[PDB]
Ligand binder design. Structure first.
Ligand SMILES: NCC1CCN(c2cc3ncccc3cc2NC(=O)c2cnn3cccnc23)CC1
Length: 286
């Protein structure tokens, strides 16, 4: 509990009730899918944990070994903690995040009340501190989205899912990974740059302001990033997009965060601010 422990598959199989695919609310252990695995709630040393059971065969093992690597090298207060792993029976064990993810909380999943603007402000500051740490350590996340911004007991932002993280000039790849709805144009075209993480963070900001998912096949607009075009071509204001589930959302602060989101969502990757400027602008906001 000061070190990365190697877990027996039978210890994990046991504390997750044989990896009980049923959700928590019905009495099961499943917390949700993501990061090329299923996340189960476990119980080790009278202490709660989150167990990711991973599910090509060599591509997955690569993402397991990447996660252990990144998680040992990158330890910050705005990053999730790795407790241990298992390869004996592939499971990654993490410190449990009682408030799940920013995505679940923005959706008010399983009776949770909406997040206030004040907590939404601190979450965005925290997530930006987390990306800044990775970026300061020549790491590119590649899959920044609200589903993997996790929330602790004080609703502190804790960035997760490092399986696709790249450790480094803009380079190109043959294997394009990430979530379309959050991805910058160049990242969709095969480029690997921390600039693409900035763009992805910009989408996260609009999700925070509006409470809306990044993509909706029937909604107009379908892609949340397109609301920037509706605001620019004066058919709407950010005011019109503010999440109705808020009490405390002030217009001066909402417009300050949207100014940050707008800069992050620049289609020209070089015109975007770096994460240090995103941090300074978000701190100025409060
Ligand atoms: N996009 C994948 C999802 C997978 C499910 N996750 C969790 C949901 C929760 N629901 C209720 C209460 C506590 C919860 C904790 C979670 N997870 C964790 O505690 C957790 C800790 N590190 N970690 C890393 C990856 C995924 N989950 C976690 C949210 C993210």
């Amino acid at each position: 509990d000061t070190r990365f422990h190697s877990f027996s598959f039978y210890e994990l199989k046991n504390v997750t009730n044989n990896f009980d695919e049923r959700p928590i609310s019905v009495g099961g252990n499943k917390m949700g899918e993501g990061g090329f695995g299923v996340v189960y709630k476990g119980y080790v040393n009278n202490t709660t944990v989150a167990v990711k059971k991973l599910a090509t065969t060599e591509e997955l093992k690569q993402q397991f070994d990447q996660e252990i690597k990144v998680m040992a090298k990158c330890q910050h207060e705005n990053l999730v903690e790795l407790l241990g792993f298992s390869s004996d029976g592939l499971c990654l064990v993490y410190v449990y995040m009682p408030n799940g993810s920013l995505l679940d909380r923005l959706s008010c999943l399983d009776g949770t009340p909406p997040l206030s603007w004040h907590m939404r402000c601190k979450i965005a500051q925290g997530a930006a501190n987390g990306i800044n740490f990775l970026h300061e350590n020549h790491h590119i996340h590649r899959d920044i989205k609200s589903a993997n911004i996790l929330l602790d007991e004080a609703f502190t932002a804790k960035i997760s899912d490092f399986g696709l993280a790249r450790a480094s000039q803009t380079v190109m790849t043959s294997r394009i990974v990430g979530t379309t709805a959050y991805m910058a144009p160049e990242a969709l075209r095969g480029e690997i740059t921390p600039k693409s993480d900035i763009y992805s963070f910009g989408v996260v900001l609009l999700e925070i302001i509006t409470g809306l998912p990044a993509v909706d096949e029937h909604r107009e607009p379908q892609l949340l990033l397109d609301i920037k075009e509706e605001i620019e071509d004066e058919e709407k204001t950010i005011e019109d997009y503010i999440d109705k589930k808020m009490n405390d959302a002030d217009s001066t602060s909402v417009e300050a965060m949207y100014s940050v989101a707008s800069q992050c969502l620049h289609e020209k990757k070089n015109k975007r601010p770096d994460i240090k400027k995103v941090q300074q602008l978000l701190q100025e906001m409060t």
